[PDB]
Ligand binder design. Structure first.
Ligand code: BCL
Ligand code: BCL
Ligand code: BCL
Ligand code: BCL
Ligand code: BPH
Ligand code: BPH
Ligand code: U10
Ligand code: SPO
Ligand code: FE
Lengths: 280, 301, 238
C-alpha cells in the first residue's frame, strides 16, 4: 500500500476543488476531484469506443477504428455511426487529458513541489488539440482530424503529409525534428553520465558531479552542469512538441501548396536569382 | 511571479575549475577558455579546458578532412561563385558511385570517388571519437555507459552508410551528402520498400523517439520541481536519499501508480534513448536485404 | 523468415529489459508497508533485486540497497479514518514537526563534499575568489515574506564551489541570528528579495544550522523541507 517513506507525506490538503471531499488514495493512486473527472471522462470514452467498435463491426484491436465526420459535415454534428461518436470521444479525451493535468497540479500542491510536470504535459495536450481541434477548425472540418485507430492514424499521417509532397520540406517540421533528435542525444548523454558516475570502474568509489563536469570538458570543451542538463532536457522536449504544433498549424491554412516549393523564396532573391551556374 | 529555476537569477563566479585529475594525462588538457555570461544564465559559464590527445587530433583532423571534401565539391558545383554557393547551399549534393561500380573503389573522382574519400574521412572521425569516448572515461575511473550508448547511434550510422551498402552489393545504396538530397534519399528509401510504416522496427523506433521526449520532459520537469530540495544533486541523492528524491518518486506514484528511484530513472533514460537507434538500425539493415516490401511482408508477418 | 525471428526476439529482449528496469527501481522504499509500518501483503509481481553496494568516496562508507528501511525519526501524524487510504492529520504544528510538504529526511548530518573532499557549499565570504558575476546582487536587500512584512536582510550568499552556483541566501533576523533560505524559493527584485512561501513571523521557525560556515545534508533537508511546507501551511497569513 505504501512505500517505506510515504506516510509522512500523505497529509490533508492541496485540492483545487471540493476541499476534503475527494482527498484520498486508492492503493498508490491519488484521487483528485480531477481523479473522478478523469475516471468518468475516460471510462465514458472507452465505452463509446467498445461501442463504435460493434457499429463498424469488430472486437479486434488492430482493426477497431473510429473516423471523424466526413468532410461534407463541415463543423457540425454527425450521426453517431457516421462520425459523431468520434466527435464525442474527442470531447471525452480532452476531458480526461485536462483533468489528468489538473490532478497533477493537486498532487504537486500536496507534495509542496513546483508545477513543472503538468506544465510540460500541457504542451502535449496542445499538440493533440492542434491535430483534432485547432487545425480542423481553421480548416472547416472535423474531417481533417486524424482517426482513432492504431494503424489507421498512420494512414492519416501519410495521406496528410504526401498532400504537400515530401513533408520533409516543411521548414518548421525541420526545426522540430532537430529538437527530437537532439533530445534523444541529450537523454542518452544525461543518463550515461549520471550512471557512469554512480557505477564507476569496479571496486572503485562513486564519482562526483566534478568528475561529470570534468568528463564533459575533457570530451568536448564544455559542460552544461547538473542544473543545466535538466533545464535543457525540458527545453529540448517542449521545443520539439512546440514546433510540431507549429508545423501542422500552418499546414493547410497559411501554406497549402507543395512544401518543397516554399524554398523558392530563398533562391529567387534579386541579388542572386538571375546569376548563372550552380543547381538553379 | 513565484520563481521557476529555468534561468538563474544571480551568477556567481570563482577561480577557473581545472577539473579532476585522475589518471588523466594533464599534459594534454588545454588551459581554460573564457567565461560566457550568456551561457551562464542557463548552465555553466565556463568554457574548457578540453583534452586533445593523439586520438583527439586524429579525430578532429579527419573530421575536418570529412567537411572540406564535401565543401570543395559544393564549391565546384557552384562554379567557384560565392553568391551561387549561398543561394544553392541546400541543393548541392555529393552523391555516391553509380550502381555499375558495385563495391569497387574504381569510380572516377568527379563521379563517386570523392564520396568514398569523404566517407573514409568520416569513418575514421567517428570511430576515433568513439575511442575518445571510452578513454576519457577510463582515465577518470568512470563506467563505460557513454561509449556503449554512443555505439547505438554508431549502429544506425554504420548500417546506413556502410553495412547495408555492403550486404546489398554496392555503394550506390548509401546516403548522399547534401541537406535536401539526404532528405530525398530518405523519402525515396521508404517509397521503394513498401512504406516504412509497415516495418515493425520503424514503429518501435518511433515509439522510443517519442518516448524520449516524454521521458526527458518528465525527468527534467521532475528534477526542476524538486530543485528546491537540491534534487539536481542526483549523485548524492543516490547515496543518501533526501526529501527531493522522495517527493519525486511519490508524485509519480500518486499520479500513475508506480515510480522510479533517483538512480533507476537514469536507467530508463539511457535505455529509452538508446533503443531509438537500436531498433532503427535493425529495421534499416533488414530492408532490401531480407524484406523488399514491408507492406507485403506485413500481410504474412 | 529472418525478420519475424528478429522482431520476436526483440519483444522477448524488451520484456526482460522492463523486468530488469522495474526491479532496479525497487532498491528504495520496498518492501511496501501498511499505514502502520508492517510489511504489506500484496508486494506486487516483481521480486526485490539482489543487493548492490556503492562505495562512498571520502572515508564516508558504504550504501547497500535494498536494505532494512526506516524513517529514523518520529512522524507526528495520526489516522483520520477507520480504513486504508485516507489522509493522516498532523498531530501538532506540521511546520515544526516536519510532516506533509514540510517533511525532511534523516539524511547524514555531515556536508556534501566536492571531488577534492572539501565542503561543497560555503558562504561566499569564505569562498576564495568567489563573487557575483551577473544579475542583481541580493546582498544587502531586505527580505519580504508573503504577508508583505520585512523579515530581515540578506547577509551573504552560500555557493556551490565546484558548480559555481548560488544555492542559499543567508538572511539576518531582528534577533541578529541568521537563517538559510533556498535560492530556488526566493525572487530577487531590484529593491528587495521576495519570499512567497513564508510569512514574516515564520522566518524564526526556519531550522537553524549548528556551524556558521557549513551545512549538513540533514540540515539542508530540514530547511528546504520547512520553506516548501509554507506554501500549504502559511496560506492563512498569505
Ligand atoms: C534518420 C533518417 C535520415 C535523416 C533524416 C533527417 C530528417 C528527416 C531531417 C534530418 C535533419 C538533419 N539531419 Mg539527417 N537523417 C539521417 C542521418 C543524418 C546524419 C548521419 C547518418 O550522419 C547526419 C550527420 C545528419 C544531419 C542532419 C542535419 C542536417 C539535421 C539536424 C540533425 C540534428 O538535429 O542532430 C542533433 C544535434 C547536433 C548537435 C548536430 N542526418 C538519415 C539518413 N535528418 C533535419 C533537417 O532539418 O534537415 C534540414 C530533418 O528534418
Ligand atoms: C509520410 C509522412 C511524412 C510526415 C508527415 C507528418 C505529419 C502529417 C505529421 C508529422 C508530425 C511529425 N513528424 Mg513528420 N513526416 C515524415 C517524416 C518524418 C520523420 C523522418 C525520420 O523522416 C520524422 C523524424 C518526423 C517527425 C515528426 C515530428 C516533428 C512530428 C511527430 C511528433 C508530435 O507531433 O508529437 C506531439 C505529441 C502528441 C500529439 C501526442 C499527444 C499525447 C496526448 C496529449 C495524451 C495521450 C494519452 C493516451 C491516450 C493514454 C493511453 C493510456 C495509457 C498508455 C495507459 N516526420 C514524412 C515525410 N509528420 C506530426 C505533427 O507535427 O504533429 C503536430 C504530424 O501531424
Ligand atoms: C504524433 C504524430 C502522429 C502520430 C504518428 C505516429 C507514428 C508515425 C507512429 C505512431 C505510433 C504510435 N502512436 Mg501515434 N501519432 C499521433 C497521435 C497519437 C496519439 C494521440 C492521443 O494524439 C496516441 C495516443 C498515439 C499512440 C500511438 C501508439 C499506438 C504508437 C506508439 C506511441 C508511443 O510510444 O509514443 C511514446 C509514448 C510512450 C512510450 C508511452 C506509452 C503510450 C502507449 C503505448 C499508448 C497506448 C495507446 C493505445 C494503444 C490507444 C489508446 C486506447 C486506450 C484504451 C484509450 N499516437 C499523431 C496523429 N504514432 C507508432 C506505431 O508503431 O503505430 C502502430 C508509429 O510508428
Ligand atoms: C517519408 C519518410 C519516411 C521515413 C523514412 C525513414 C528512414 C529511411 C529512416 C527513418 C528513421 C527514423 N524515422 Mg522514419 N520516416 C517516415 C516517417 C517518420 C515519422 C512520421 C511519419 O511522423 C517519424 C516520427 C519518424 C521517425 C523516425 C526515427 C525514429 C528514425 C530515426 C532515429 C534517429 O534518431 O535518427 C537520427 C540518428 C542518426 C542518424 C545516427 C547519427 C550517428 C552519427 C554517428 C552522427 C555523426 C555526426 C557527424 C560527425 C557530423 C556532426 C557534426 C557535428 C556538429 C560535430 N519517421 C516516413 C514513412 N525514417 C531511420 C530509421 O532508423 O528507420 C528504421 C531511417 O533510416
Ligand atoms: C510535451 C513533451 C512530450 C510529452 C510529455 C508528457 N506526457 C505526459 C506527461 C508529460 C510531461 C505527464 O505528466 C503524463 C503522465 O502521466 O506520464 C506518465 C503524460 C502522458 N502522456 C502519455 C502519452 C503520450 N505522450 C506523448 C508525447 C509527449 N508527451 C511529448 C513528446 C505521446 C506520443 C508522442 O504519442 C503519447 C502516446 C500518457 C502516458 C500520459 C497521460 C495519461 C492521461 O492523460 O490519462 C488520461 C486518460 C486516460 C487514462 C484514458 C484514455 C482516454 C479516452 C478518452 C479514450 C482514448 C482517446 C483517443 C485519442 C485514442 C487515440 C488512439 C490512438 C491509436 C491514436
Ligand atoms: C542514442 C541515439 C542518439 C545519439 C547518441 C549519441 N551521440 C553521440 C553520443 C551519444 C551517446 C556521444 O557520445 C557522442 C558525443 O561526443 O556527444 C557529445 C555523440 C555524437 N553525436 C553527434 C552527432 C549526432 N548524433 C545524432 C543522433 C543521436 N546520437 C541519436 C538521437 C545525430 C543525428 C540525430 O543526426 C547527430 C548529427 C556528435 C556531436 C558526436 C560525434 C562526433 C564525431 O564523431 O566527431 C567527428 C568530428 C567532426 C565532424 C568535426
Ligand atoms: C528522479 O525522479 C523521478 C522519479 O522518481 C524517483 C520517477 O519516478 C519518474 C517517473 C519515471 C519512471 C517511473 C520510468 C517509467 C516511465 C515511462 C517510460 C513513461 C511511460 C508511462 C507509462 C507507460 C504508464 C502510464 C500509465 C498511466 C497513465 C496510469 C493509468 C493506469 C491505469 C490502468 C488506471 C488509471 C487510474 C485513473 C483512471 C485515475 C483516477 C483514480 C481512481 C482509481 C478513481 C521520473 C521521470 C523522475 O524523474
Ligand atoms: C564555407 O566553406 C568551406 C570550404 C570552408 C567548407 C564548407 C563546407 C560545407 C558547407 C559542408 C556541408 C556539409 C553537409 C551539408 C553535410 C551533410 C551531411 C548529411 C546531411 C548527412 C549524412 C548522412 C551520412 C551517412 C549515413 C554516412 C555514413 C558513412 C559511413 C558509415 C562510412 C563507411
Ligand atoms: Fe537526471
Amino acid at each position: 500500500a505504501l512505500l517505506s517513506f510515504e506516510r509522512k507525506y500523505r497529509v490533508p490538503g492541496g485540492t483545487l476543488v471540493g476541499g476534503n471531499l475527494f482527498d484520498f488514495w486508492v492503493g498508490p493512486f491519488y484521487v483528485g476531484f480531477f481523479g473522478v473527472a478523469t475516471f468518468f471522462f475516460a471510462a465514458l470514452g472507452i465505452i463509446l469506443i467498445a461501442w463504435s467498435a460493434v457499429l463498424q463491426g469488430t472486437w479486434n484491436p488492430q482493426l477497431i477504428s473510429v473516423y471523424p465526420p466526413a468532410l461534407e459535415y463541415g463543423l457540425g454534428g454527425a450521426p453517431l455511426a457516421k462520425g459523431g461518436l468520434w466527435q464525442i470521444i474527442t470531447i471525452c479525451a480532452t476531458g480526461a487529458f485536462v483533468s489528468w493535468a489538473l490532478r497533477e497540479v493537486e498532487i504537486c500542491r500536496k507534495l509542496g513541489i513546483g508545477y513543472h510536470i503538468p506544465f510540460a504535459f500541457a504542451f502535449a495536450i496542445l499538440a493533440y488539440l492542434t491535430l483534432v481541434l485547432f487545425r480542423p477548425v481553421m480548416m472547416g472540418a472535423w474531417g481533417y482530424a486524424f482517426p482513432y485507430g492504431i494503424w489507421t492514424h498512420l494512414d492519416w499521417v501519410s495521406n496528410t503529409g504526401y498532400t504537400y509532397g515530401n513533408f520533409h520540406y516543411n521548414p518548421a517540421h525541420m526545426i522540430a525534428i532537430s529538437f527530437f533528435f537532439t533530445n534523444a542525444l541529450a537523454l542518452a548523454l544525461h543518463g550515461a553520465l549520471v550512471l557512469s558516475a554512480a557505477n564507476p570502474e569496479k571496486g572503485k568509489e562513486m564519482r562526483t558531479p566534478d568528475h561529470e563536469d570534468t568528463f564533459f570538458r575533457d570530451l568536448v570543451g564544455y559542460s552544461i552542469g547538473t542544473l543545466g542538463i535538466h533545464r535543457l532536457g525540458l527545453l529540448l522536449s517542449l521545443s520539439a512538441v512546440f514546433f510540431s504544433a507549429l508545423c501542422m498549424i500552418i499546414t493547410g491554412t497559411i501554406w497549402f501548396d507543395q512544401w518543397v516549393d516554399w524554398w523558392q523564396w530563398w533562391v529567387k532573391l534579386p541579388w542572386w536569382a538571375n546569376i548563372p551556374g550552380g543547381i538553379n | 511571479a513565484e520563481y521557476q529555476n529555468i534561468f538563474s537569477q544571480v551568477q556567481v563566479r570563482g577561480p577557473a575549475d581545472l577539473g579532476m585529475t585522475e589518471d588523466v594525462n594533464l599534459a594534454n588538457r588545454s588551459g581554460v577558455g573564457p567565461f560566457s555570461t550568456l551561457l551562464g544564465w542557463f548552465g555553466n559559464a565556463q568554457l574548457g579546458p578540453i583534452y586533445l590527445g593523439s586520438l583527439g587530433v586524429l579525430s578532429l583532423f579527419s573530421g575536418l578532412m570529412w567537411f572540406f571534401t564535401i565543401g570543395i565539391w559544393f564549391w565546384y558545383q557552384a562554379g567557384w561563385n560565392p553568391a551561387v554557393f549561398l543561394r544553392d547551399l541546400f541543393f548541392f549534393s555529393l552523391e555516391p558511385p553509380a550502381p555499375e561500380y558495385g563495391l569497387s573503389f574504381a569510380a572516377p573522382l568527379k563521379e563517386g570517388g570523392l564520396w568514398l574519400i569523404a566517407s573514409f574521412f568520416m569513418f575514421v572521425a567517428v570511430w576515433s571519437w568513439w575511442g575518445r569516448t571510452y578513454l576519457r572515461a577510463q582515465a577518470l575511473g568512470m563506467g563505460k555507459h557513454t561509449a556503449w550508448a554512443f555505439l547505438s547511434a554508431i549502429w544506425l550510422w554504420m548500417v546506413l552508410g556502410f553495412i547495408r551498402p555492403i550486404l546489398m552489393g554496392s555503394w550506390s545504396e548509401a546516403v548522399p551528402y547534401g541537406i535536401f538530397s539526404h532528405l530525398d534519399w530518405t523519402n525515396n528509401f521508404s517509397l521503394v520498400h513498401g512504406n516504412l510504416f509497415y516495418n515493425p522496427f520503424h514503429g518501435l523506433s518511433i515509439a522510443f523517439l517519442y518516448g524520449s521526449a516524454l521521458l526527458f520532459a518528465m525527468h527534467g520537469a521532475t528534477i526542476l520541481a524538486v530543485s528546491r530540495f537540491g534534487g539536481e544533486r542526483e549523485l548524492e541523492q543516490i547515496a543518501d536519499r533526501g526529501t527531493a528524491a522522495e517527493r519525486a518518486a511519490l508524485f509519480w506514484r500518486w499520479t500513475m501508480g508506480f515510480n522510479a528511484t533517483m538512480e533507476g530513472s537514469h536507467r530508463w533514460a539511457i535505455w529509452m534513448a538508446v533503443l531509438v537507434t537500436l531498433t532503427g538500425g535493425i529495421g534499416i539493415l533488414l530492408s532490401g536485404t531480407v524484406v523488399d516490401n514491408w507492406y507485403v511482408w506485413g500481410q504474412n508477418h | 523468415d529472418l525478420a519475424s525471428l528478429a522482431i520476436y526476439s526483440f519483444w522477448i529482449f524488451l520484456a526482460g529489459l522492463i523486468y530488469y528496469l522495474q526491479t532496479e527501481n525497487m532498491r528504495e522504499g520496498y518492501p511496501l508497508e501498511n499505514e502502520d509500518g508492517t510489511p504489506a501483503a500484496n508486494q506486487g509481481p516483481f521480486p526485490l533485486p539482489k543487493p548492490k553496494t556503492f562505495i562512498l568516496p571520502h572515508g564516508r562508507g558504504t550504501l547497500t540497497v535494498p536494505g532494512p528501511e526506516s524513517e529514523d525519526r518520529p512522524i507526528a501524524l495520526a489516522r483520520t479514518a477507520v480504513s486504508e487510504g485516507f489522509p493522516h492529520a498532523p498531530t501538532g504544528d506540521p511546520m515544526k514537526d516536519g510532516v506533509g510538504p514540510a517533511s525532511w529526511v534523516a539524511r547524514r548530518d555531515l556536508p556534501e563534499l566536492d571531488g577534492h573532499g572539501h565542503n561543497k557549499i560555503k558562504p561566499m565570504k569564505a569562498a576564495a575568489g568567489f563573487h557575483v558575476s551577473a544579475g542583481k546582487n541580493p546582498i544587502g536587500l531586505p527580505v519580504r515574506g508573503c504577508d508583505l512584512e520585512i523579515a530581515g536582510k540578506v547577509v551573504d550568499i552560500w555557493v556551490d564551489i565546484p558548480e559555481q552556483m548560488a544555492r542559499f541566501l543567508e538572511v539576518e533576523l531582528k534577533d541578529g541570528s541568521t537563517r538559510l533560505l533556498p535560492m530556488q524559493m526566493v525572487k530577487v527584485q531590484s529593491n528587495r528579495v521576495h519570499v512567497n512561501a513564508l510569512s514574516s513571523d515564520l522566518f524564526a521557525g526556519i531550522p537553524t544550522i549548528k556551524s556558521p560556515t557549513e551545512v549538513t545534508l540533514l540540515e539542508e533537508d530540514k530547511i528546504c523541507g520547512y520553506v516548501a511546507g509554507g506554501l500549504m501551511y502559511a496560506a492563512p497569513k498569505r
